[PDB]
Amino acid sequence: GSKTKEGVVHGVATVAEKTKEQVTNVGGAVVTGVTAVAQKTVEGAGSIAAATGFV
Amino acid sequence: GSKTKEGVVHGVATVAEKTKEQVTNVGGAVVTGVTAVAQKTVEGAGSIAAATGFV
Amino acid sequence: GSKTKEGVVHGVATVAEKTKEQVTNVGGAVVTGVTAVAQKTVEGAGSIAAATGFV
Amino acid sequence: GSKTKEGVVHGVATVAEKTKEQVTNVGGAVVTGVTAVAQKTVEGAGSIAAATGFV
Amino acid sequence: GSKTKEGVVHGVATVAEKTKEQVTNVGGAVVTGVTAVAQKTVEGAGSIAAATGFV
Amino acid sequence: GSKTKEGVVHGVATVAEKTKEQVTNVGGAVVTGVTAVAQKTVEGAGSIAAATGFV
């Protein structure tokens, strides 16, 4: 390419006012709060916020 | 390409005022709060916010 | 291409005022709150906010 | 009062995409682009976006 | 009061994408771009975005 | 008061992408770009973004 962008996040402004935030987890998988994330994966598998319980 | 964009997030403004936020999980999978995420995957599988219970 | 966009999110403004937000999960899969997400997947499978209970 | 609001702006989300914006003024008064403004005035005169040419 | 708000702006999210923005002024008064402004004035005069040409 | 707010700005998120921004002024008054401003004035006159040409 010449002027390319791929897997790009730009120009973001975020505010989060939370008086109480609580997470309880037993034997599982919890994913919370992913923000402004970017990736590019070539010839492989790619997951951003993936939760899996058991196998 | 010449001026390309793919898998791009730009120009985002977000506000989140939450007085109480609670997550309880047992033996499963919880995904919460994904915001302004971008990826590009070539020749592979790609998932952003995927939850799976067991296998 | 020359001036392309694909899998792109731009120019977004969001507000979320929530006084109480609660998530309870047992043995399943919960996905909540995905906002302003973009991806492009080439020659592979791609899912944004997918929940699956068991296998 | 007990739970009052007066002269209040809340919960606003705005987007403005403009490719070209031009303002030319000679000897006058121009007011442009007022957004999400609040005031409360007690025992006095109050104007938000007021233009006046001469006196 | 007990739980009051007056002259308050909260919970605002704004985006402005402008490719070219130009202002030309001769001998006058120009006001442009006021956003998310609050005041409270007691026993006096109060103006937010006021333009006046001459006197 | 007990839990008061007056002349308050909170919880603001703003984005401004501008490729070219130009201001030219001769002999006047230009006010541009006021954002997230708050004041409270007691027993006096109060103006936020006020332009005046001559006197």
Q: Which residue of F has its CA nearest to B17?
A: F11
Separation CA C51–CA B50 (nearest Å): 6
Separation CA F42–CA E7 (nearest Å): 14
Note the resolution in Å, 1 decimal: 3.2
Q: Which two tokens stand for residue C16?
A: 């979320």
Q: Mark A5-44 as b/e (b = at least 16 C-beta within 10 Å).
A: bbbbbbbbbbbbeeeeeeeebeebbbbbebbbbbbbbeee
Instruction: Output phi, psi for F33, to 5 deg.
Output: 95, 25
**Neighbour tally for D2: CB within 10 Å:** 8
- E27: closest CA among D26, D50, D32? D26
Annotated binding-site members of C for Cu cation: 10
- The residue ranges of DSSP E strands in E1-55, in sequence order, are 6-26, 30-32, 35-42, 46-52
| Contact (CB<8Å) A15/F12 | yes
| Contact (CB<8Å) A8/B36 | no
Check if B5 contacts F (Cβ < 8 Å). no
Separation CA D44–CA F42 (nearest Å): 11
Chain E residues with CB under 8 Å of F14 CB are 12-16, 35-36
User: To the nearest whole angstrom, how far is the Cα of F8 from the nearest Cα of chain E?
Assistant: 5
Separation CA D34–CA E50 (nearest Å): 11
Output the CA torsion sign for A8, D14, E20, E49.
Answer: negative
Query: Kind of pairing, strands D35-42 and B30-32?
Result: unpaired
Chain D residues with CB under 8 Å of F53 CB are 27, 29
User: To the nearest whole angstrom, how far is the Cα of F49 from the nearest Cα of chain D?
Assistant: 10
Instruction: Output phi, psi for B35, to 5 deg.
Output: -145, 135
Q: Which residue of E has its CA nearest to D15?
A: E15
Q: Which two tokens stand for residue E55?
A: 């006197």
CB B33 within 8 A of CB A55: no
Separation CA F7–CA E55 (nearest Å): 30
Q: Which residue of F has its CA nearest to B18?
A: F11
- Compute the residue count for chain E: 55
| Contact (CB<8Å) C47/B42 | no
Residue owning tokens 């006001």: E31
Is residue E39 classed exposed, middle or buried when 0-12, 13-18 and 19+ CB atoms within 10 A define those classes? buried
Instruction: Output phi, psi for F28, to 5 deg.
Output: -125, -135
User: To the nearest whole angstrom, how far is the Cα of E13 from the nearest Cα of chain B?
Assistant: 6
Separation CA C29–CA C42 (nearest Å): 27
CB B34 within 8 A of CB C35: yes
Experimental method: cryo-EM
β-bridge mates for residue D38, sequence order: E38
**Between chain A and chain D, are at least 3 CB pairs below 8 A?**
no
Instruction: Output phi, psi for A54, to 5 deg.
Output: -125, -170
Separation CA F15–CA F31 (nearest Å): 19
Separation CA E38–CA B44 (nearest Å): 51
| Contact (CB<8Å) F27/E26 | yes
How many CB contacts within 8 angstroms connect chain A with chain B?
227
- D14: closest CA among E15, C7, C38? E15
Separation CA A30–CA E26 (nearest Å): 60
Q: How far is CA F25 from the centre of its chain?
A: 19
